[PDB]
Amino acid sequence: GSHMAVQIGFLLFPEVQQLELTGPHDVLASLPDVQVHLIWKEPGPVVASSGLVLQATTSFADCPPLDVICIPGGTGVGALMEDPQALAFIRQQAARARYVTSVCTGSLVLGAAGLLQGKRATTHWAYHELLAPLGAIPVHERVVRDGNLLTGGGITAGIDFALTLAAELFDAATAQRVQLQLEYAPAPPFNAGSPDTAPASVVQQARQRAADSLHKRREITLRAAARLAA
Amino acid sequence: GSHMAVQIGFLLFPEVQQLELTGPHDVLASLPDVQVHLIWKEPGPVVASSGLVLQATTSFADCPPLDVICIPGGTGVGALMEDPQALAFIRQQAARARYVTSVCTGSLVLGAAGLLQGKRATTHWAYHELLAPLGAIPVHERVVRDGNLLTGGGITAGIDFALTLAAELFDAATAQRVQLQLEYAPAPPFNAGSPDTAPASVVQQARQRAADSLHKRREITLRAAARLAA
Q1: Residue pair B196/B205 in contact by the 8 Å Cβ criterion
Q2: CA–CA dist A53, B139 (Å, integer)
Q3: Which Pfam families does this chain map to (chains A, B) (predicted)?
Q4: Which of A165, A191, B34, B199 is the most buried (most CB within 10 A)?
């Protein structure tokens, strides 16, 4: 436009964990002159894992070349990891995007697309064993950066790394202004956001509850890895 | 259902600040047996302040009696504060809801509805002077609780108070399980989420940028107060 419009794109897919997307979306959409896209095979309604309905704004084919791509996570990642069109789109955009990012098991989609080989990366704690088969150097940190690749472990990690992106695309003062204008000042009333700080009973419950999903996602991951290896 | 379904409702209005809604929505929608509603004058598309499109699931008339009501904030609050139908709906639901909650300037809607008189409450820092005219005892804390009323100051305060609500509706272990399963572990890369911690230059920028909106919202607030006083 009259200024350089940073093109920011989020993959929006059925059964996305919507907050993984909508958090970084609202932060990045607050930045000067940007244009933010919600990308799927087609524009139109896409249902998140909660049933909340989001609207894709562009197809893969019509999406502009992105400066920032972000792959959120959620239940729908398992399908996406074997979606040949989606993986081809992600590889195309990642080839030249200044920033390639993900939240939770969105990094396993990056991995299935061949974008994690030899890269430090994280994913959701319950699925962290799935990084190494996709070639990643697995790291247990809230946001892992390797060059222009930023992978966030937990649900709101994109809110936090969105401020990092703001600071580099614009300047620190701009990032701080957005944080203050939004009044982003988290203070959770529990300390159970990590398996290392939650009560052991709670960790055991969570790991038992994720077992079938992990088992399926492991099968998917190993198929994805085998494709990359061939 | 086979268990007691807690009815949780968010006001979804044009020019909502979407993350104020979508954060607490994803947390609360994770809880056992709940049914979560996005409420407007009619079901269907509602455009957030960023342009992101959300879908209302129910009209005011068809919304069940709520156990939890939450009024998010955003630019669209100014209109809502003088929307006779919306204010009547909020008063009806608030009369019996176990919890009445808001995020950012959503509390000014509660105030316009007459629900803050003599109550401790907060709102977005840039608009905090608008609490006293609506009868509130203004408090500068991230989440202010007065009985069953919970008002959150900043954009993601609903994520945090949603975990408090989880713990009381269910139990602490349930709230902790949800925090761990979502991996909600915030760690912002800047400390500018409060006017007391942001750099002075950044505060000055933010206050200059909010001046016209504050001026208009003040006019609206004083009209709303005068209606309550009559």
Answers
A1: no
A2: 35
A3: DJ-1_PfpI (PF01965)
A4: A165
**Local structure of A12: helix, strand or coil:** coil
Number of neighbours of residue A172 by Cβ within 10 angstroms: 16
At residue B89, φ and ψ (nearest 5 deg) are: -60, -50
Q: How far apart are the first and last CA of chain B?
A: 43
Looking at the structure, give the CATH architecture of the domain made up of residues B1-230. 3-Layer(aba) Sandwich (3.40)
Hey, what are B131's tokens? 């609490």
* Active-site amino acid positions of B: 104
Q: Is B105 on the interface with A (CB under 8 A)?
A: no
User: Domain limits of chain A?
Assistant: 1-230
A28, B40, B77 from B61: Cα distances, Å: 35, 9, 21
> Count of CB contacts below 8 A, A vs B?
224
The technique by which this structure was obtained is X-ray
Name the strands in the sheet holding A53-56, side by side, starting at the edge strand that comes first in the sequence: A44-47, A53-56, B53-56, B44-47
Q: How far apart are CA B200 and CA B197, in angstroms?
A: 8
Q: Which two tokens stand for residue B221?
A: 């607030």
Distances (CA, A) of B220 to A65, B48, B225: 43, 21, 9
Resolution in angstrom units: 1.0
* CA–CA distance, B75 with B48 (Å, rounded to integer): 9
d(CA A13, CA B15): 24
Residue A96, both tokens:
């030249």
Nearest-by-CA chain A residue for B54: A54
Contact A159, B134 (CB under 8 A): no
B99 beta partners: B68
How far apart are the C-alpha atoms of B63 and B180, rounded to whole Å?
31
The alpha carbon of residue A96 is apart from the nearest alpha carbon of chain B, in Å, by 26
Q: What's the token pair of residue A190?
A: 């529990």
**What CA–CA distances, in Å, run from A81 to A58, A225, B42, B183?**
20, 10, 37, 21
Helix (H/G/I), strand (E/B), else coil: B38: strand
Residue B130 CA to residue A223 CA, distance in Å, equals 58
